[PDB]
Design a protein around this ligand. Structure first.
Ligand SMILES: C/C=C(/C)C(=O)O[C@H]1C(C)=C2[C@H]([C@@H]1OC(=O)CCCCCCC)[C@@](C)(OC(C)=O)C[C@H](OC(=O)CCC)[C@@]1(O)[C@H]2OC(=O)[C@@]1(C)O
Ligand SMILES: Nc1ncnc2c1ncn2[C@@H]1O[C@H](COP(=O)(O)OP(=O)(O)OP(=O)(O)O)[C@H]2OC3(O[C@H]21)C([N+](=O)[O-])=CC(=[N+]([O-])O)C=C3[N+](=O)[O-]
Ligand SMILES: [Cl-]
Ligand SMILES: [K+]
Ligand SMILES: [Mg+2]
Ligand SMILES: [Mg+2]
Length: 982
């Protein structure tokens, strides 16, 4: 039954054809099951391990790096293998790296908890239905509840289906709908049809939504929808539907990878360009250079280096209490352009606070004076002080304030509890009432010593003094008609009727103040006149529709109550006349106040070019008032077309909506799906958006946003949906979390540039040793070992570079900003040209012009393949020698050690930026050298690798070749800052 909130109770009973008095039939329930299925959100299952590993292989660079590992296996099989059988295992290192880099990724994806299973925790197991099967109530499996069933709910029950209320058997039925509206105050339901067929859950006061739970009362209803078709079912349907996008950086690495897949295909054509005429050996040569061509092109270990860089940011962030569940999100938080954030529980403490209160002062003539007070503290904890005119006063010095707190402590069902496990006070009962309980604690009316109390005894210390002052005989409950409630108290002394027993009354100000024939002035009573009533009804309207928009409760007493045996308590309708001839005492103003640090944190995002949008299910006038307090709006700023309710927003034509999401800062009366749209719209303008929330109703927006941030105090659902938890609930840690993102990516830019322009030299070299007939090509094992650990250690040290000073004064980077720019392309083309020649020039220097180099002949080194009169006097097996290739390896090692010293800063001299500033960089160069020394001096490693040679002079030669790269860059660096300024 769709739109059941708008039809009558008879109409709903008629829609299915049932009476309340007797349920559905076994005939009906069987047919309904076959029509509507069972009552359950369907579980969503993760990917199988087979289908998870396969996803690692979809990337092209690993799809071609896999292809090169296979090609190596064949070459390993052939007699070059069998000449040196032990050292054919270079593919296994390739394969092992592909297996490792894939295994860390699957563990990244395998370790993950399900936010839909977290939602199904709101499905109750059992349900109470009346069916025609039997006369009594029937407790059955809630998944067997079909629509049209008659169901019953009492205190503490989870509502098992979306239910239209038929009969509220208690006085009020109070429901906790935080799962849909994000609010915590109990909603008072009714049975009258709500007509608008496009009313939001906040307006559907006659509905009971599956997942929500009953706070107080008992009710009977008829099921409107079961299973996925329910408001909570729409939440997960939009949660399973959303699909998280590719990181902007991972887009570039896919962009970059997609181009190597093409430029690798092209260099293989230029090798075949050797057709200038002006079989196993020929085959092996085409392949043995193709494999090394791929190994020299794709930056292996860059996935390894990137992973450990984020993993350390995860570790440093946890020091600042930001728990990062997804490692790729530590950089996307830097380019956050917009921050969408929930209100209650996020920007505010979600703890009702009594900010202001007043009582009468003077009443003479048409003049009426009020004592107005201010109460500090933004939490249920009894911490905070009462102020009059911003100077602290002692509440118990005002006789009117004594009565005000007595009414607050006695006309109250709520309590205060200190959770020793959590270390924080928690409400016991209604949020609205618990606020009054905390007020009495802050305003220690009878001056009870509370400094030495344990934290558990402090919770109710002051209320318990008042409880022992007067005995609470009975309580006239809250009822919808009068919007008021009362308690009947007897003095519990020997004075009895002389000191007199009293009625204490609290409720909506209009209803109470009408039934107030007197006005309390301290101890004395004065008749309620026109002027006095207006003066108090004036201030209430000011506190109601002001810059402080506060729910006001009127506190009155009845000094001469009716006779205890004269009042009947079966009937909630006589209660209003019972609460008559009252004496007005005072008024209190309530607010879920913003967290201490939220305001300043917003100003910091504004300073960093990040806007903040509030999106709340709370009433609009309240969200606007919290917005002014936070700084989203000005204190006197006339919000006009800048704050919309979900309905007003939905009423705009689709075109105007996207423009609204760019100019509007506040959104209220919002259903869960409304938040996901606004995120989606902001994303349509291609700015990275961040969603902060804590409730279940935020899980759609938390998933859609590129970066979800859940509060620690929030629901599990919200955490499971998001990529970051604020352990300490400190909103300031978001601003700090961004700073890390901006800083990391800057360092990521360096070690990506550093590791890539290292890869570009390995292709210039491998091409030179292939275009010209040079024997000495770098062996793939060297490129691997260097690109993995010899280049890995330095690149990771670029991750520790100092951050920029203005890092938080620049606007967010464009997500499509390219890493290698225009000149920086040339700068690395020139750097790539050098290191490409420096490794191949060493190769020739051994044979041609060296004392231990027997070859010489240069022109014959270029044509050494055939190997007799042209090769006479020289051994052919001397070209396989390991000594001529150490220079190539040691050139590349020393130049990339030096190129890493150029990577500590783009476009800036190291004469001006000494490597001292990054001490980590220098130590990492040492270990790559110390490990390089190891790969040259221990038989198991110089057998796979090359042998040390010309130690006295070769080392000088490599150091003599590697120096000009610092000058090449330092000249290119000076060319850069001379031209960038103009
Ligand atoms: C030689 C080794 C590599 C890995 C290579 O070819 O990378 C190219 C390449 C794919 C790009 C280029 C490289 O371009 C060249 O190398 C041009 C000359 C090639 C001839 C050499 C043979 C004689 C990078 C290396 O810039 C330079 C320094 O030339 C990175 C850059 O931006 C990045 O991808 C950096 C972020 C990872 C990309 O041009 C990139 O392609 C893109 O899609 C871009 C736009 O992104
Ligand atoms: N934003 C808020 N700030 C402060 N309080 C809020 C706020 N929102 C709701 N409440 C309190 O919560 C109860 C929720 O009832 P509900 O039907 O949702 O009423 P609304 O006034 O909110 O109409 P609305 O949905 O906004 O159009 C109300 O009952 C009472 O105080 C109200 C109430 N009253 O409204 O008059 C009287 C009362 N006693 O005891 O007299 C107890 C309440 N209570 O415990 O929640
Ligand atoms: Cl509203
Ligand atoms: K997300
Ligand atoms: Mg919330
Ligand atoms: Mg309201």
């Amino acid at each position: 039954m769709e739109a059941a909130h708008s039809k009558s109770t008879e109409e709903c009973l008629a829609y299915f054809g049932v009476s309340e008095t007797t349920g559905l039939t076994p005939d009906q329930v069987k047919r309904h099951l076959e029509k509507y299925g069972h009552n359950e959100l369907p579980a969503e299952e993760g990917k199988s391990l087979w289908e998870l590993v396969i996803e690692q292989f979809e990337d092209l660079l690993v799809r071609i790096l896999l292809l090169a590992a296979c090609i190596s296996f064949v070459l390993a099989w052939f007699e070059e293998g069998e000449e040196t059988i032990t050292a054919f295992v270079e593919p296994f290192v390739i394969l092992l790296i592909l297996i490792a880099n894939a295994i860390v990724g699957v563990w990244q994806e395998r370790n993950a908890e399900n936010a839909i299973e977290a939602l199904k925790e709101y499905e109750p197991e059992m349900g109470k239905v009346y069916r025609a099967d039997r006369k009594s109530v029937q407790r059955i499996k809630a998944r067997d509840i079909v629509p049209g069933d008659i169901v019953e709910v009492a205190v503490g029950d989870k509502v098992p289906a979306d239910i239209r209320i038929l009969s509220i058997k208690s006085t009020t039925l109070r429901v906790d709908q935080s799962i849909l509206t994000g609010e915590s105050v109990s909603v008072i339901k009714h049975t009258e049809p709500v007509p608008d067929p496009r009313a939001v859950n906040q307006d559907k006061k006659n509905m009971l939504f599956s997942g929500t739970n009953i706070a107080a009362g008992k009710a009977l209803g008829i099921v409107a929808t079961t299973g996925v078709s329910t408001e909570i079912g729409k939440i997960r349907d939009q949660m399973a539907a959303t699909e998280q996008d590719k990181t902007p950086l991972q887009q570039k690495l896919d962009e970059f990878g997609e181009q190597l897949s093409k430029v690798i295909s092209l260099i293989c054509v230029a090798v075949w360009l050797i057709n200038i005429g002006h079989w196993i050996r020929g085959a092996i040569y085409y392949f043995k250079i193709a494999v090394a061509l791929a190994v020299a092109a794709i930056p292996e270990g860059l996935p390894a280096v990137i992973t450990t860089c984020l993993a350390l940011g995860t570790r440093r962030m946890a020091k600042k209490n930001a728990i990062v569940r997804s490692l790729p999100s530590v950089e996307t938080l830097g380019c956050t352009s917009v921050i969408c954030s929930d209100k209650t529980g996020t920007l505010t403490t979600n703890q009702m606070s009594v900010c202001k209160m007043f009582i009468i002062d003077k009443v003479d003539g048409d003049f009426c004076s009020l004592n107005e007070f201010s109460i500090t503290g933004s939490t249920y904890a009894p911490e905070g002080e009462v102020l009059k005119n911003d100077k602290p006063i002692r509440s118990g010095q005002f006789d009117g304030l004594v009565e005000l707190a007595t009414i607050c402590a006695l006309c109250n069902d709520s309590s205060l509890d200190f959770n020793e496990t959590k270390g924080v006070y928690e409400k016991v009962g209604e949020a609205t009432e618990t606020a009054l309980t905390t007020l009495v604690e802050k305003m220690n009316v009878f001056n009870t010593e509370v400094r030495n109390l344990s934290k558990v005894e402090r919770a109710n210390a002051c209320n318990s003094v008042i409880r022992q002052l007067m005995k609470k005989e009975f309580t006239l409950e809250f009822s919808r008609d009068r919007k008021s409630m009362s308690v009947y108290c007897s003095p519990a002394k020997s004075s009895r009727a002389a000191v007199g027993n009293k009625m204490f009354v609290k409720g909506a100000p209009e209803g109470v103040i009408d039934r107030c024939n007197y006005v309390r002035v301290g101890t004395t009573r004065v008749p309620m006149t026109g002027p006095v009533k207006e003066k108090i009804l004036s201030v209430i309207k000011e506190w109601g529709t002001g810059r402080d928009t506060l729910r006001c409760l009127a506190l009155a007493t009845r000094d001469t109550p009716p006779k205890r045996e004269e009042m009947v308590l079966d009937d909630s309708s006589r209660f209003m006349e019972y609460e008559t001839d009252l004496t007005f005492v005072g008024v209190v103003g309530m607010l879920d106040p913003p967290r201490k640090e939220v305001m300043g944190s917003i100003q910091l995002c504004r300073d960093a070019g990040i806007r903040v949008i509030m999106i709340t299910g709370d009433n609009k006038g309240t969200a606007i008032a919290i917005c002014r307090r936070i700084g989203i709006f000005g204190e006197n700023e006339e919000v006009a077309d800048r704050a919309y309710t979900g309905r007003e927003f939905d009423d705009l034509p689709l075109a105007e909506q996207r423009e609204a999401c760019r100019r509007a800062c506040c959104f209220a009366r919002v259903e869960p799906s409304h938040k996901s749209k606004i995120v989606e719209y902001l994303q349509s303008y291609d700015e990275i958006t961040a969603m902060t929330g804590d409730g279940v109703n935020d899980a759609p927006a938390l998933k859609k946003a590129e970066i979800g941030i859940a509060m620690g105090s929030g629901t599990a659902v919200a955490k499971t949906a998001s990529e970051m938890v604020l352990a300490d609930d400190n909103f300031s840690t978001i601003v700090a979390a961004v700073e890390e993102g901006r800083a990391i990516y800057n360092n990521m830019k360096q070690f990506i540039r550093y590791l890539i322009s290292s890869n570009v030299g390995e292709v210039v070299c491998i091409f030179l040793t292939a275009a010209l007939g040079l024997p000495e090509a770098l062996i793939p094992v060297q490129l691997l070992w260097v690109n993995l650990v010899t280049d890995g250690l330095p690149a990771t040290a670029l991750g520790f570079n100092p951050p920029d000073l203005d890092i938080m004064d620049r606007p967010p980077r464009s997500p499509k900003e390219p890493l290698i720019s225009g000149w920086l392309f040339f700068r690395y083309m020139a750097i790539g040209g050098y290191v490409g020649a420096a490794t191949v020039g060493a190769a020739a220097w051994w044979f041609m012009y060296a004392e231990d180099g027997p070859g010489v002949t240069y022109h014959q080194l270029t044509h050494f393949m055939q190997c007799h009169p042209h090769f006479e006097g020289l051994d052919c097996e001397i070209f396989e020698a390991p000594e001529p290739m150490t220079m190539a390896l040691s050139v590349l090692v020393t130049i990339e050690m030096c190129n890493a010293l150029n990577s500590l800063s783009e476009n800036q001299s190291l004469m001006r930026m000494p490597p001292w500033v990054n001490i980590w960089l220098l130590g990492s160069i040492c270990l790559s050298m110390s490990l390089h020394f190891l790969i040259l001096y221990v038989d198991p490693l110089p057998m796979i690798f090359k042998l040390k040679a010309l130690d006295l002079t070769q080392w000088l030669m490599v150091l003599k070749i590697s120096l000009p790269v610092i000058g090449l860059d330092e000249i290119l660096k000076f060319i850069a800052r001379n031209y960038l300024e103009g």
